[PDB]
Scaffold this motif. Structure first.
Motif, PDB file in Angstrom:
ATOM      1  N   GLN A 299       0.819  -1.207   0.000  1.00 59.72           N
ATOM      2  CA  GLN A 299       0.000   0.000   0.000  1.00 59.72           C
ATOM      3  C   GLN A 299       0.855   1.260   0.000  1.00 59.72           C
ATOM      4  O   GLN A 299       0.401   2.314  -0.459  1.00 59.72           O
ATOM      5  N   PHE A 300       2.083   1.175   0.508  1.00 57.68           N
ATOM      6  CA  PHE A 300       3.001   2.308   0.513  1.00 57.68           C
ATOM      7  C   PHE A 300       3.725   2.486  -0.812  1.00 57.68           C
ATOM      8  O   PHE A 300       4.503   3.437  -0.949  1.00 57.68           O
ATOM      9  N   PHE A 301       3.507   1.598  -1.777  1.00 62.42           N
ATOM     10  CA  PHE A 301       4.145   1.704  -3.079  1.00 62.42           C
ATOM     11  C   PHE A 301       3.219   2.253  -4.153  1.00 62.42           C
ATOM     12  O   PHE A 301       3.697   2.613  -5.234  1.00 62.42           O
ATOM     13  N   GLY A 302       1.923   2.330  -3.886  1.00 63.46           N
ATOM     14  CA  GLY A 302       0.997   2.886  -4.854  1.00 63.46           C
ATOM     15  C   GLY A 302      -0.412   2.377  -4.607  1.00 63.46           C
ATOM     16  O   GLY A 302      -0.763   1.999  -3.488  1.00 63.46           O
ATOM     17  N   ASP A 303      -1.200   2.377  -5.683  1.00 63.48           N
ATOM     18  CA  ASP A 303      -2.607   1.988  -5.629  1.00 63.48           C
ATOM     19  C   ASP A 303      -2.708   0.506  -5.975  1.00 63.48           C
ATOM     20  O   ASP A 303      -3.063   0.111  -7.087  1.00 63.48           O
ATOM     21  N   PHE A 304      -2.384  -0.327  -4.987  1.00 64.92           N
ATOM     22  CA  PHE A 304      -2.370  -1.771  -5.187  1.00 64.92           C
ATOM     23  C   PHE A 304      -3.782  -2.295  -5.431  1.00 64.92           C
ATOM     24  O   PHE A 304      -4.718  -1.949  -4.705  1.00 64.92           O
ATOM     25  N   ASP A 305      -3.930  -3.145  -6.449  1.00 61.29           N
ATOM     26  CA  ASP A 305      -5.229  -3.694  -6.834  1.00 61.29           C
ATOM     27  C   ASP A 305      -5.477  -4.985  -6.061  1.00 61.29           C
ATOM     28  O   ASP A 305      -4.804  -5.996  -6.288  1.00 61.29           O
ATOM     29  N   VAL A 306      -6.468  -4.962  -5.164  1.00 58.07           N
ATOM     30  CA  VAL A 306      -6.796  -6.122  -4.344  1.00 58.07           C
ATOM     31  C   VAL A 306      -7.980  -6.907  -4.884  1.00 58.07           C
ATOM     32  O   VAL A 306      -8.372  -7.912  -4.276  1.00 58.07           O
ATOM     33  N   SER A 307      -8.557  -6.488  -6.008  1.00 61.37           N
ATOM     34  CA  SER A 307      -9.768  -7.115  -6.524  1.00 61.37           C
ATOM     35  C   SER A 307      -9.465  -8.446  -7.205  1.00 61.37           C
ATOM     36  O   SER A 307      -8.473  -8.585  -7.927  1.00 61.37           O
ATOM     37  N   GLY A 308     -10.339  -9.424  -6.972  1.00 61.70           N
ATOM     38  CA  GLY A 308     -10.300 -10.676  -7.703  1.00 61.70           C
ATOM     39  C   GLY A 308      -9.147 -11.593  -7.381  1.00 61.70           C
ATOM     40  O   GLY A 308      -8.914 -12.552  -8.122  1.00 61.70           O
ATOM     41  N   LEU A 309      -8.416 -11.337  -6.302  1.00 64.00           N
ATOM     42  CA  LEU A 309      -7.289 -12.184  -5.943  1.00 64.00           C
ATOM     43  C   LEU A 309      -7.785 -13.465  -5.285  1.00 64.00           C
ATOM     44  O   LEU A 309      -8.590 -13.422  -4.350  1.00 64.00           O
ATOM     45  N   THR A 310      -7.308 -14.604  -5.785  1.00 65.26           N
ATOM     46  CA  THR A 310      -7.611 -15.918  -5.235  1.00 65.26           C
ATOM     47  C   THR A 310      -6.432 -16.431  -4.419  1.00 65.26           C
ATOM     48  O   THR A 310      -5.276 -16.206  -4.793  1.00 65.26           O
ATOM     49  N   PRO A 311      -6.690 -17.118  -3.307  1.00 61.31           N
ATOM     50  CA  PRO A 311      -5.586 -17.604  -2.470  1.00 61.31           C
ATOM     51  C   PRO A 311      -4.653 -18.520  -3.247  1.00 61.31           C
ATOM     52  O   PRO A 311      -5.084 -19.313  -4.086  1.00 61.31           O
ATOM     53  N   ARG A 312      -3.358 -18.382  -2.968  1.00 54.94           N
ATOM     54  CA  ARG A 312      -2.251 -19.117  -3.575  1.00 54.94           C
ATOM     55  C   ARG A 312      -2.010 -18.738  -5.032  1.00 54.94           C
ATOM     56  O   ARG A 312      -1.121 -19.321  -5.665  1.00 54.94           O
ATOM     57  N   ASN A 313      -2.760 -17.786  -5.588  1.00 60.86           N
ATOM     58  CA  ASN A 313      -2.521 -17.275  -6.939  1.00 60.86           C
ATOM     59  C   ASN A 313      -2.494 -15.750  -6.904  1.00 60.86           C
ATOM     60  O   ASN A 313      -3.362 -15.083  -7.479  1.00 60.86           O
ATOM     61  N   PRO A 314      -1.500 -15.165  -6.244  1.00 59.00           N
ATOM     62  CA  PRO A 314      -1.473 -13.709  -6.078  1.00 59.00           C
ATOM     63  C   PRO A 314      -0.964 -13.017  -7.336  1.00 59.00           C
ATOM     64  O   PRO A 314      -0.436 -13.639  -8.256  1.00 59.00           O
ATOM     65  N   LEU A 315      -1.135 -11.695  -7.356  1.00 55.51           N
ATOM     66  CA  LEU A 315      -0.669 -10.860  -8.452  1.00 55.51           C
ATOM     67  C   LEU A 315      -0.138  -9.551  -7.885  1.00 55.51           C
ATOM     68  O   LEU A 315      -0.470  -9.154  -6.765  1.00 55.51           O
ATOM     69  N   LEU A 316       0.697  -8.880  -8.674  1.00 64.61           N
ATOM     70  CA  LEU A 316       1.333  -7.624  -8.280  1.00 64.61           C
ATOM     71  C   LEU A 316       0.935  -6.571  -9.313  1.00 64.61           C
ATOM     72  O   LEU A 316       1.583  -6.430 -10.354  1.00 64.61           O
ATOM     73  N   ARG A 317      -0.133  -5.832  -9.018  1.00 65.96           N
ATOM     74  CA  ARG A 317      -0.751  -4.916  -9.971  1.00 65.96           C
ATOM     75  C   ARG A 317      -1.013  -3.576  -9.296  1.00 65.96           C
ATOM     76  O   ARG A 317      -1.615  -3.531  -8.219  1.00 65.96           O
ATOM     77  N   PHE A 318      -0.579  -2.490  -9.932  1.00 68.75           N
ATOM     78  CA  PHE A 318      -0.750  -1.144  -9.396  1.00 68.75           C
ATOM     79  C   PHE A 318      -1.498  -0.271 -10.394  1.00 68.75           C
ATOM     80  O   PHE A 318      -1.134  -0.215 -11.573  1.00 68.75           O
ATOM     81  N   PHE A 319      -2.534   0.416  -9.917  1.00 70.12           N
ATOM     82  CA  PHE A 319      -3.225   1.404 -10.735  1.00 70.12           C
ATOM     83  C   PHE A 319      -2.426   2.701 -10.784  1.00 70.12           C
ATOM     84  O   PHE A 319      -1.695   3.040  -9.848  1.00 70.12           O
TER      85      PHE A 319
END
Ligand SMILES: *[C@@H]1O[C@H](CO)[C@@H](O[C@@H]2O[C@H](CO)[C@@H](O[C@@H]3O[C@H](CO)[C@@H](O)[C@H](O[C@@H]4O[C@H](CO)[C@@H](O)[C@H](O[C@H]5O[C@H](CO)[C@@H](O)[C@H](O)[C@@H]5O)[C@@H]4O)[C@@H]3O)[C@H](O)[C@H]2NC(C)=O)[C@H](O)[C@H]1NC(C)=O
Ligand SMILES: *[C@@H]1O[C@H](CO)[C@@H](O)[C@H](O)[C@H]1NC(C)=O
Length: 485
Positions: free
Chosen positions: A352-372
């Motif tokens: 959250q301190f790096f930008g607008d992290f996208d938390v939508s649609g994340l499934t456990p054990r399949n994470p993603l690193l996405r910033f708006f």
């Protein structure tokens, strides 16, 4: 407006091609419009579309067409490459007794020599569920400390880690201590990070409505990874166009690792189940941590991933306080940033301190690193339409007045001869008007139909007549002046 092309060797015989641009923007309650929207076939002037080849043919809209384009916020998607898993906070346990009593050099020694079936710390195994001695992990049995003189200087210097009293001569007093490495319940998955890809969504709304002098709606979604969409049984296609590459200055996280909490080995610890919960307040507490703070081999002390070799092989281990070699773990970074988050400050590890992290649609054990992002950019969208039902054809041929034949006899009857010259089997509609001015009652124009090569004559019931030849749609071809009476 766009033209119409023949469909060369996308299913069609004739094709309408239009190119539009859509841009995203932060609209508000007052100014709420970022959309690109265009209408066709509603006005009396924009009802026709020029053909690419053979200009003698124009295509008129059978319906009025509504197309609307909107663009989402622009997101930077960072590819993740799985590295391994890492324990949240390893901890040291100290044993000064066993099932026989206190550890001492006389009758009940601490055992940690490699190969013993009797280690006071026990072994760890690889796989972890194995008990085969061949699967023992090297250095997992820990090490012993006692009331002897170490290789370095001092008097009973190895007493410190275990808190041994090397002065009591008493069989209830332990004189040796075992030191074992353990891992807490929470395990993080760590990923390496590649260079980002741009991502966005473009919604294309194509709405067909009847002409006016019920509506239909098809929605096409476009993205950089899926830039071509279809609608109405392949009759329509839209395609986003451009260099979707990231721009200069986009933040890079190459030197970092993405640390996602994943596993609780003891699900009965409520604190652990919270750390892996996929709710927005905890997902925003996932961490980017510089790689040089991590040891992938576990043989470096005070680094994320420290393991048995670093713990056992630390210089002057028995002279150090407990939990030595086990500093600066993921739990310490978490607590550090948590206290900053709990006080409204800005930390250094939470995403959250790096930008607008996208938390939508994340499934456990399949994470993603996405910033708006902030970005606004225009994207060209090319649309294609099967002209079979959207347009009917309208043909335009040349047409002349036959001057050597069109006369006027001395009663008002105008004998007019018109010819369409050229080749073709598609008739064209023509309008003939007459403006005999001096004291002559009005003459109603008449529509005539002529295929190329045809020739027809029509009669119209001190004067002069202005006779004008007009096309089917807003054009004038030939005008002849003829005297009367
Ligand atoms: C694809 O694109 C097509 C066209 O590009 C869209 O169709 C268009 O949809 C529009 C809205 O969905 C529509 O505009 C409407 O006209 C109606 C009257 O003819 C309105 O009732 C309708 O909703 C109103 O919008 C007002 C905006 O604020 C709003 O104030 C109003 O509510 C007040 O008024 C009513 C009385 O009417 C009161 O009861 C109420 O209490 C409020 O006081 C109401 O919400 C809107 O104005 C266009 O006519 C459509 N055009 C065509 C050609 O069909 C599709 O919807 C798009 N499809 C998708 C999936 O997005
Ligand atoms: C977007 O950029 C403007 C200047 O270009 C800046 O003032 C603003 O803070 C930025 N906002 C975000 C969310 O990045």
């Amino acid at each position: 407006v766009g033209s119409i092309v023949t469909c060369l060797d996308i299913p069609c015989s004739k094709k309408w091609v239009l190119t539009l641009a859509v841009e995203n923007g932060a609209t508000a309650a007052s100014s709420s419009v970022s959309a690109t929207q265009a209408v066709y076939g509603s006005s009396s002037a924009n009802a026709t579309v020029r053909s690419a080849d053979n200009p003698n043919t124009v295509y008129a809209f059978k319906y009025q067409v509504h197309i609307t384009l909107t663009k989402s916020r622009i997101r930077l998607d960072y590819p993740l490459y799985y590295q391994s898993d890492f324990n949240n906070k390893p901890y040291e346990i100290v044993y000064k007794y066993n099932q026989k009593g206190p550890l001492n050099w006389l009758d009940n020694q601490c055992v940690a020599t490699w190969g013993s079936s009797d280690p006071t710390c026990g072994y760890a195994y690889n796989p972890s569920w194995s008990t085969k001695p061949a699967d023992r992990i090297l250095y997992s049995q820990g090490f012993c400390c006692d009331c002897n003189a170490g290789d370095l200087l001092g008097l009973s210097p190895n007493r410190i880690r275990g808190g041994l009293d090397c002065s009591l001569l008493n069989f209830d007093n332990p004189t040796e201590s075992a030191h074992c490495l353990r891992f807490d319940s929470l395990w993080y998955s760590a990923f390496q990070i590649g260079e980002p890809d741009v991502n966005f969504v473009i919604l294309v709304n194509v709405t067909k409505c009847p002409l006016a002098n019920n509506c239909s709606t098809e929605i096409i979604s476009l993205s950089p990874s899926s830039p071509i969409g279809y609608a109405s049984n392949g009759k329509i296609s839209a395609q986003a166009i451009g260099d979707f590459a990231p721009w200069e200055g986009t933040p890079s996280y190459s030197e970092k690792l993405f640390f996602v909490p994943s596993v609780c080995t003891d699900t009965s610890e409520a604190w652990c189940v919270d750390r892996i919960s996929y709710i927005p307040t905890e997902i925003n507490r996932w961490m980017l941590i510089d790689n040089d703070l991590v040891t992938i081999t576990g043989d470096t002390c005070d680094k994320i991933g420290v393991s048995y070799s670093a713990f056992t092989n630390e210089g002057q281990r028995c002279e150090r306080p407990t939990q030595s070699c086990l500093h600066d773990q993921l739990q310490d970074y978490y607590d550090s940033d948590l206290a900053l988050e709990q006080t409204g400050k800005v930390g250094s590890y939470f995403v959250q301190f790096f930008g607008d992290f996208d938390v939508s649609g994340l499934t456990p054990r399949n994470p993603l690193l996405r910033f708006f992002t902030n970005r606004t950019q225009a994207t060209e969208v090319v649309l294609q339409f099967a002209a079979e039902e959207l347009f009917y054809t309208i043909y335009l041929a040349p047409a002349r007045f036959l001057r050597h034949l069109s006369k006027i006899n001395p009663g008002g009857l105008i004998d007019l001869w018109i010819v369409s010259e050229g080749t073709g089997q598609n008739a064209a509609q023509f309008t003939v008007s007459a403006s005999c001015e001096p004291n002559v009652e009005p003459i109603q124009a008449q529509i005539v139909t002529l295929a190329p090569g045809q020739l027809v004559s029509i009669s119209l019931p001190a004067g002069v007549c202005n006779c004008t030849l007009r096309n089917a749609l807003g054009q004038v071809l030939d005008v002849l002046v003829l005297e009367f009476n």
